[PDB]
Write a structure and sequence with these properties.
The PDB classes it as hydrolase. Two copies of one chain form a homodimer. Chain A is an alpha/beta fold. Chain A has helices spanning about 5-15, 25-40, 90-100, 120-130, 140-150, 175-180, 190-195, 235-245, 270-290; strands at about 50-55, 60-65, 70-75, 100-105, 135-140, 160-165, 225-230, 250-260. Chain A is built from nine helices and eight strands. Bound molecules: 2-ethoxycarbonylbenzoic acid.
Chain lengths: ~290, ~290
């Protein structure tokens, strides 16, 4: 169990900002509660960073920073029900400022109003419209979208790399982290239903394989996969990196001791979380600079 | 004056541990106050990172992380009078953790007991003995030493890049920052003089101790030069980037509004300083990806 007082403090502040009763509350109510949480922890925008919104392949997007030879496409998390351009704004802004690469955040369609495969179709639509060298990165459900995009766009259009931040990649639940972290801090459980049911293929039945179940991972972009140790999805990161290397893809698994799911919001009060984001930025830069 | 409350608090905490009259104390007392201030701000080491002390080229060094194809040589600051392996330990450890590059910190000999060119000879000793592709980085007087190394090793030989963090580079003192920031927090123009006597006594100054006065800069490694805006030394960064581009060298100038000299120690409590270090890490990673 977590003993780092900084991240116990972060956990306490997240729970206080986010009363654990949001569930059959309403998708409308969960979106409101999630933004109120995000605002507690939100950092300031870097002054001087240019930021504007723009439709790209029919999907609303937010663009951070000046045009660059290599970009970063960021796909936010939220279990395909919550989140948007404002929920992950400061993370994208800091990626842009630190790397000097232009960042494009994708406001993909959310369920229950738009069920799968709307989310991956929107990501593919932005990716195909951008038609440029780019690293792709995402957290949680947005990490799964990032992984699925790479798998569906192999060949010339492949991203230069995939940076996956505590992703859920479709593990079947049998891995140890689902046991060891079943009551992990910041886990809502009542979200897993909203995210499996309707939302995903568990909504009108459909195969459309999730990354951990595709068998030909050969040729997809090199991966940097970072997990929270205290998170049931931890071993999805372990498992996907192990499968990626068996396919001859370069991939690294970084597991973060003492951190829960969602810890990017703790980077302004936790040394552990801040170091993790520093490593995430360096992995992005590593993929972007071509070699 | 600075108005960012986060930075003002950092300055208040610094001044309580390292009173501005320490710059004029004896070397031994100055060293004790500097070490005490370092302890106030020191972050924890990454728990999984291998760290060991080793003499390299005869000079005692500290090595962070496993051996890597590209390394990072970090040269600590402290006006050539204070500092050491422990004073900058957490910065080095965080570079190694974030980049995956091995970091070598150099415990060069200190003034007033060891006059120039002891410091640059110690850095050359380590560099030559390493015999390794590497990026060189340093803060303040350590940035001057990294710039002086690049100018003295322009053959086989050369750093892959130079990351200079609020460096003093031998500006003559007439640029606007020396007046506008003469009474700046944490570093005044008058403190500059005390340390200069401590490095050369009162003899003739070796041209290599003044990179901004060196006539030919043609083939030095490309540079990322970040300055604190509220720092008398700020325009040394602006000036050197200008002179480097006039010599065909690629150079980026980043200036940091609302930050004083020494802001690396504020990265755990200041959004501005935290983002600056994120950019510094990315610049290192940019330069490192080669050989
Ligand atoms: C004691 C902290 O060091 C200094 O203030 C300092 C003073 C003069 C020149 C450089 C530095 C520096 O290397 O930072």
């Amino acid at each position: 169990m977590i003993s780092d007082p900084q991240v116990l403090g972060f956990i306490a502040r997240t729970e206080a900002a986010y009363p654990p009763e949001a569930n059959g509350a309403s998708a409308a109510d969960n979106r409101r509660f999630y933004d109120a949480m995000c605002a507690v922890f939100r950092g300031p925008r870097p002054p001087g960073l240019v930021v504007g919104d723009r439709r790209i392949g029919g999907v609303p997007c937010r663009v951070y920073g000046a045009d660059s030879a290599v970009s970063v496409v960021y796909v936010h998390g939220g279990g395909f029900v919550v989140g948007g351009l404002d929920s992950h704004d400061d993370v994208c802004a800091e990626i842009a400022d630190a790397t000097g690469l232009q960042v494009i955040a994708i406001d993909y369609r959310l369920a229950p109003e738009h069920r799968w495969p709307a989310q991956i179709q929107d990501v593919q639509a932005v990716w195909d419209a951008l038609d440029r060298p780019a690293v792709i990165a995402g957290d949680s459900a947005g990490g799964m979208l990032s992984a699925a995009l790479c798998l569906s766009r192999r060949g010339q259009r492949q991203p230069l790399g995939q940076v996956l931040i505590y992703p859920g990649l479709g593990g079947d639940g049998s891995a140890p982290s689902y046991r060891e972290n079943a009551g992990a801090p910041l886990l809502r459980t009542e979200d897993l239903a909203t995210y499996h049911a309707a939302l995903h293929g568990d909504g009108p039945v459909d195969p459309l394989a999730l990354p951990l179940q595709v068998e030909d991972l050969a040729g997809v972009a090199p991966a940097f996969v970072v997990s929270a140790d205290v998170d049931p999805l931890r071993d999805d990161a372990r498992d996907y990196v192990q499968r990626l290397r068996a396919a001859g893809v370069a991939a690294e698994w970084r597991n973060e001791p003492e951190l829960p799911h969602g810890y990017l919001r703790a980077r302004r009060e936790s040394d552990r979380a801040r170091r993790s984001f520093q490593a995430i930025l360096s992995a992005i830069m590593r993929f972007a600079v071509r070699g």
